[PDB]
Nucleic acid binder design. Structure first.
Ligand SMILES: [Mg+2]
Ligand SMILES: [Mg+2]
Ligand SMILES: [Mg+2]
Ligand SMILES: [Mg+2]
Ligand SMILES: [Mg+2]
Ligand SMILES: [Mg+2]
Ligand SMILES: [Mg+2]
Ligand SMILES: [Mg+2]
Ligand SMILES: [Mg+2]
Ligand SMILES: [Mg+2]
Ligand SMILES: [Mg+2]
Ligand SMILES: [Mg+2]
Ligand SMILES: [Mg+2]
Ligand SMILES: [Mg+2]
Ligand SMILES: [Mg+2]
Ligand SMILES: [Mg+2]
Ligand SMILES: [Mg+2]
Ligand SMILES: [Mg+2]
Ligand SMILES: [Mg+2]
Ligand SMILES: [Mg+2]
Ligand SMILES: [Mg+2]
Ligand SMILES: [Mg+2]
Ligand SMILES: [Mg+2]
Ligand SMILES: [Mg+2]
Ligand SMILES: [Mg+2]
Ligand SMILES: [Mg+2]
Ligand SMILES: [Mg+2]
Ligand SMILES: [Mg+2]
Ligand SMILES: [Mg+2]
Ligand SMILES: [Mg+2]
Ligand SMILES: [Mg+2]
Ligand SMILES: [Mg+2]
Ligand SMILES: [Mg+2]
Ligand SMILES: [Mg+2]
Ligand SMILES: [Mg+2]
Ligand SMILES: [Mg+2]
Ligand SMILES: [Mg+2]
Ligand SMILES: [Mg+2]
Ligand SMILES: [Mg+2]
Ligand SMILES: [Mg+2]
Ligand SMILES: [Mg+2]
Ligand SMILES: [Mg+2]
Ligand SMILES: [Mg+2]
Ligand SMILES: [Mg+2]
Ligand SMILES: [Mg+2]
Ligand SMILES: [Mg+2]
Lengths: 79, 136, 94
RNA sequence: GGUUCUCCCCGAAAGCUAUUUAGGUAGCGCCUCGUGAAUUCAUCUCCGGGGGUAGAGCACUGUUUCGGCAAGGGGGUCAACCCGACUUACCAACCCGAUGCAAACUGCGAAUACCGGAGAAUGUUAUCACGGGAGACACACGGCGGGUGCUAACGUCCGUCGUGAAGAGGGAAACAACCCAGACCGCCAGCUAAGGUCCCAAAGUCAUGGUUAAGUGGGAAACGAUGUGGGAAGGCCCAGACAGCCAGGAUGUUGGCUUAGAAGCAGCCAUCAUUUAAAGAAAGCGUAAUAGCUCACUGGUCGAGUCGGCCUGCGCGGAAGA
RNA sequence: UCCUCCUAAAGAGUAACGGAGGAGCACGAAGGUUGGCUAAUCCUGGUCGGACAUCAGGAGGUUAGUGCAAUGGCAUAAGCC
RNA sequence: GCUCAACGGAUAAAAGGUACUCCGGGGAUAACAGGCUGAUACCGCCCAAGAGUUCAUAUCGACGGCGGUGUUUGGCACCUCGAUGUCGGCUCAUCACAUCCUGGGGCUGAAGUAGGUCCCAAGGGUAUGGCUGUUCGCCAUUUAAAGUGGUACGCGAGCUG
RNA sequence: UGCCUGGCGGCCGUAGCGCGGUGGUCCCACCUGACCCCAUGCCGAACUCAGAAGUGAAACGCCGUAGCGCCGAUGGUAGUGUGGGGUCUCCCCAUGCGAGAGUAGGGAACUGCCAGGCAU
């Protein structure tokens, strides 16, 4: 017989994009869950404790790449 | 036998050797032996072929071994059950794709090169073929 | 000297290229200058015979396409990975 | 383990979580019935967004080869005791120029998968919510991307679809997982798919051009050999291509040798030089060794086809079990 | 028991007695605000002082750093006063 | 106020043997067998550094590779736990040919007698005793040999233990 | 209306480095000195508060340079969603989607507000 190590693992946190862009959201709705600030907060977008982007106003979610470093920003178009 | 001096990890997945070759032309010497089939060459086979070609040419030139064994192949010990972790590392192989150049040389004449590669190819499972460098 | 009687490629694509290669031919491209690139279809054996000569990649070549002779140079060539075959050839218009 | 009369309609699972739990149970995922509900849901077309998996690459993290720049060492050829003249079938930091590999590498990057917005057409609302009732948490095979194993198992573990489970028929001899195709009933009706049309066994001994001589068809590899057609490309050409055969085939020279006599059949080196009309101190060779023959190299007869390397289909040997 | 990477097939999730590592804490400051600041490495000169410190200049731009293992981020700095 | 860490935690409070065992079940799950694969096992073949006075093939053959059988050791748990008795010994044989002898040939580093290797060929034959329960093996003496395997590692509704 | 300068933005790797030398009548920088009121955990190295003696020397900005970094076609290749196949550890065809790298080439940024100084 024998024994083997490294048999441990961790539970997934279900990260990723939730609204996927182009959807109609409400105030306080969570858009993306992530560890690091891969997507930065834009217009009417707040940053959570764990870098979660929540919309502060109902409207449309838009993905764009702005900034000097070509960073992705989430924008809330209040149409 | 040649193998990497150190690696980040000891064990690797089996993987699949599908696709085409990357280095398909001789860029160092003038004559080359290149694999035409598909398989996995081992360090022992590479060393045997290198020794055969070296003793055939009497080291009257240069030899280039394009491929390098870097994939650790592990086998479980005999008479043991399934599971209980992954088997210990056994040897090292190099994934081979069709059209990839295996050995390169120069200086020696065409007859000597073809008579040396002819006996150096029998030490490898994968069928090989002889080519000469061209202008692009 | 190195004259190649070419034609005009009717359809382009992976399937068209495979059919051309199976029909003892191979596609090629002539680009450069200001004129639009021209896709041509060449016979395999005759071009394979000239490829052995070292002058093919050094001196100018004449391509006759529907009677219009064009001076081109063998810019780049793609060959079969493990077979004496020609996949695709580029020609700079000069 | 067993659970007894009939018919009609609908109809799954062997999955997740927890469990002194793993062959039980509870909730959910899946099923049935009833009540309500919105263009609710599904297919297709257009539009917006996320990728970071194939593939590709070495800008980063690891690995690796040959070159230049180099410090140079290790048996020196040579002194043979020298500074070592010098490279001694060796190794050798960065820097540049190329060549590869990576599930825990990505300066890049698809198809598909998934969400949302708009639109026609179709589908017995197929969609959602609640309540009554269950059943079930032993799955297997094949296709696809994989871990593990030996890219071994009718082996095992994951994700999608199909199949059976819960499914009759036709085809592959039989053969749940392959292919075609979804059995309301009855027919001495026709058509077709898989699959065939010489007889078992039903329908081409059909038509048009080729390959096969092995019964290949109707088991298998590395390799090997003028089987046989095809495709080009080569060289030798009436200035006579190749094999018969008629013949020559020399000297200084029994070449320094090494010895065994060595003169080619024991040897490192030599096949230097007269005529070369032609002319190998000779490749075979009997042999104590020569003393002999032949061929290499040629010109005497011929008289139209040859010489050997690739891309190709079939075929041959490797092929030995009760 | 919990967390990080891959297998995990470019949304989420996804198994094995698979491959690799950690966690059962610390901090009244290691938190809040304001103001200010930008390394690792290497080269040159210089008294001890050295393959190494403390200094002055230059090459380089995050190849440093995160209280911790790993992943994703940090220049407006999440890095340092 | 609980390393209830067996961490969705039985109770504040818990170790072993049974071959003296028994009950309900499983081939859902093992041991002997049969099936599947062949890592390992046996055998065959491919190229050639050489050994062999020079000389690679008369005999071998390193560094390497490709295969056949199921044939030992191995993996799965697919039939069997509402029963398939497995070691060895006696009698009884069949089949395979990868042939021990006999039979017919090739090569030979085959002078002869007597040898090495390879091909075809299964028609026939192919030990007696001491040791230990033997298979295996050692020894003593013969023969041409006392050949290798499968048959539920053959055969206990043919026999012992 | 045209020259260049300043401030705020869009666009954030054809928008950035290297080389050549120009700019001051304006604006900016260098700079003078500093008890204040402020400052260095030491120094006006940085903030500043009082200004114009000089300079464009460093910067800043502008014009050309193909030495770089980059943007990168057409064609070809790899991959594949569906269906159908072979000799099935992998590959073929009918179909659409079609990469990465490397060629041809492009290239020494455009553009919106006011705020002045210039000729008109
Ligand atoms: Mg296609
Ligand atoms: Mg139904
Ligand atoms: Mg139970
Ligand atoms: Mg209902
Ligand atoms: Mg996916
Ligand atoms: Mg219900
Ligand atoms: Mg219910
Ligand atoms: Mg369960
Ligand atoms: Mg259960
Ligand atoms: Mg069951
Ligand atoms: Mg299952
Ligand atoms: Mg499956
Ligand atoms: Mg599979
Ligand atoms: Mg399998
Ligand atoms: Mg099972
Ligand atoms: Mg059942
Ligand atoms: Mg059926
Ligand atoms: Mg059937
Ligand atoms: Mg009919
Ligand atoms: Mg028909
Ligand atoms: Mg048909
Ligand atoms: Mg058919
Ligand atoms: Mg048929
Ligand atoms: Mg027929
Ligand atoms: Mg009939
Ligand atoms: Mg055949
Ligand atoms: Mg055969
Ligand atoms: Mg995912
Ligand atoms: Mg701050
Ligand atoms: Mg308590
Ligand atoms: Mg418990
Ligand atoms: Mg019992
Ligand atoms: Mg069963
Ligand atoms: Mg068994
Ligand atoms: Mg059985
Ligand atoms: Mg020898
Ligand atoms: Mg027998
Ligand atoms: Mg025989
Ligand atoms: Mg008999
Ligand atoms: Mg007879
Ligand atoms: Mg027996
Ligand atoms: Mg019986
Ligand atoms: Mg200046
Ligand atoms: Mg293209
Ligand atoms: Mg491209
Ligand atoms: Mg490009």
């Amino acid at each position: 017989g024998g024994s083997t190590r490294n048999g441990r693992d961790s539970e997934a946190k279900r990260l990723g994009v939730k609204r996927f862009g182009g959807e109609s959201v409400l105030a306080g709705s969570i858009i993306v869950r992530q560890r690091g600030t891969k997507f930065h907060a834009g217009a009417n977008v707040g940053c959570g404790r764990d870098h979660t982007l929540f919309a502060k106003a109902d409207g449309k979610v838009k993905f764009e790449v702005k900034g000097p470093k070509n960073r992705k920003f989430i924008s809330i178009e209040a149409e | 036998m040649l193998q990497p001096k150190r690696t980040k990890f000891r064990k690797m997945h089996k993987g699949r050797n599908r696709g085409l070759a990357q280095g398909t032309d001789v860029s160092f010497g003038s004559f080359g032996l290149k694999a035409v089939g598909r398989g996995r060459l081992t360090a022992r086979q590479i060393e045997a072929a290198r020794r055969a070609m070296t003793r055939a040419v009497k080291r009257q030139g240069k030899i280039w071994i394009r491929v390098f064994p870097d994939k650790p192949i592990t086998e479980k010990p005999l008479a043991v059950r399934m599971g209980k972790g992954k088997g210990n590392v056994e040897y090292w192989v190099a994934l081979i794709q069709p059209g990839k150049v295996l050995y390169e040389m120069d200086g020696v004449p065409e007859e000597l090169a073809r008579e040396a590669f002819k006996l150096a190819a029998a030490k490898l499972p994968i069928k090989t073929t002889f080519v000469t460098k061209t202008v692009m | 000297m190195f004259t190649i009687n070419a034609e005009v490629r009717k359809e382009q694509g992976k399937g068209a290229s495979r059919r051309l290669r199976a029909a003892n031919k191979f596609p090629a491209i002539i680009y450069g200058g200001k004129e639009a690139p021209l896709a041509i279809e060449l016979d395999h054996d005759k071009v394979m015979n000239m490829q052995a000569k070292a002058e093919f990649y050094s001196e100018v070549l004449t391509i006759v396409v529907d009677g219009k002779e064009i001076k081109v140079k063998a810019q780049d060539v793609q060959r079969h990975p493990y077979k004496p075959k020609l996949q695709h050839i580029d020609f700079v218009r000069a």
